[PDB]
Amino acid sequence: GAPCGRISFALRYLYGSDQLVVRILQALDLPAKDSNGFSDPYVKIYLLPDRKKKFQTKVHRKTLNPIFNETFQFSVPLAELAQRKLHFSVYDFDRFSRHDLIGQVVLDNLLELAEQPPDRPLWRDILEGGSEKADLGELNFSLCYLPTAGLLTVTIIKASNLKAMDLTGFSDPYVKASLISEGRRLKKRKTSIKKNTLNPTYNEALVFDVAPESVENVGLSIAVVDYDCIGHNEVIGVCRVGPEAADPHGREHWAEMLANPRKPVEHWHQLVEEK
Ligand SMILES: [Mg+2]
Ligand SMILES: [Mg+2]
Ligand SMILES: [Mg+2]
Ligand SMILES: [Mg+2]
Numbered sequence: 001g002a003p004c005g006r007i008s009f010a011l012r013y014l015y016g017s018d019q020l021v022v023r024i025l026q027a028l029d030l031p032a033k034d035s036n037g038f039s040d041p042y043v044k045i046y047l048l049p050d051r052k053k054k055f056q057t058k059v060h061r062k063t064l065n066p067i068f069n070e071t072f073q074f075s076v077p078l079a080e081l082a083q084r085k086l087h088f089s090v091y092d093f094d095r096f097s098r099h100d101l102i103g104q105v106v107l108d109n110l111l112e113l114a115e116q117p118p119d120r121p122l123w124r125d126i127l128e129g130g131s132e133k134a135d136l137g138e139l140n141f142s143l144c145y146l147p148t149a150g151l152l153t154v155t156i157i158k159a160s161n162l163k164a165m166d167l168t169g170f171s172d173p174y175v176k177a178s179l180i181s182e183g184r185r186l187k188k189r190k191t192s193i194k195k196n197t198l199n200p201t202y203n204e205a206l207v208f209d210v211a212p213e214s215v216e217n218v219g220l221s222i223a224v225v226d227y228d229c230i231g232h233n234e235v236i237g238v239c240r241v242g243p244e245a246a247d248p249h250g251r252e253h254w255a256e257m258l259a260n261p262r263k264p265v266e267h268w269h270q271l272v273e274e275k
């Protein structure tokens with residue numbers, strides 16, 4: 001994590017009252033999440049051990065260099081600073097979509113910093129900002145194409161654990177049927193649309209008209225988009241079943257996408273493919 005700017009804070013350990021004061025000062029060069037070029041940032045703040053006593057800075061609109069200047073206290077046992085870290089989270093802020101996380105920072109040696117004083121601005125880097133990592137769900141379907149009239153069966157049964165893209169905690173799933181590399185994107189196929197649910201169940205098929213030899217493309221990449229009326233539809237995840245040596249499960253799933261003219265091609269794949 002680097003393009004994720006830097007944030008300025010100060011911290012003192014008030015004595016007598018045994019509280020740990022913390023001041024969020026400001027941040028520089030935060031990334032530009034929103035499209036207009038800016039970001040509406042704000043930061044969560046909690047004492048790592050107990051991940052449930054958080055604090056929240058006001059949000060600042062359109063600016064990659066917000067000036068917080070907000071102080072929060074944490075009544076804590078003097079010597080308790082031992083087993084205790086400090087977590088900072090900076091998220092973009094949105095009104096309906098899920099809040100993007102820009103970066104976080106961890107203040108390991110909480111003790112030393114007890115140093116001094118209120119005015120002790122001590123910059124730190126905003127980390128975490130590269131590629132994938134976590135989950136997104138995993139969809140299940142069954143491929144089945146017959147050489148006869150040439151019908152590549154792409155029946156989508158269900159999927160589960162889908163990522164919530166709404167703040168409500170849900171998503172309005174549906175899936176797109178497509179291919180890869182060569183293109184053939186001039187031939188897509190969308191499923192139904194199931195409201196508020198992280199484990200849709202379609203039991204719907206996708207009628208295709210492909211040919212024999214043409215099956216050496218090993219191409220058919222599908223994705224789980226989230227139908228949003230407010231903003232525009234976003235892809236929650238994708239799979240591929242194609243020449244993606246990154247997912248053997250699929251390419252094999254392709255080879256065995258014959259032999260037994262239906263069903264078998266079952267055994268869902270992951271969706272941790274953010275395309
Ligand atoms: Mg935005
Ligand atoms: Mg916004
Ligand atoms: Mg957003
Ligand atoms: Mg929605």
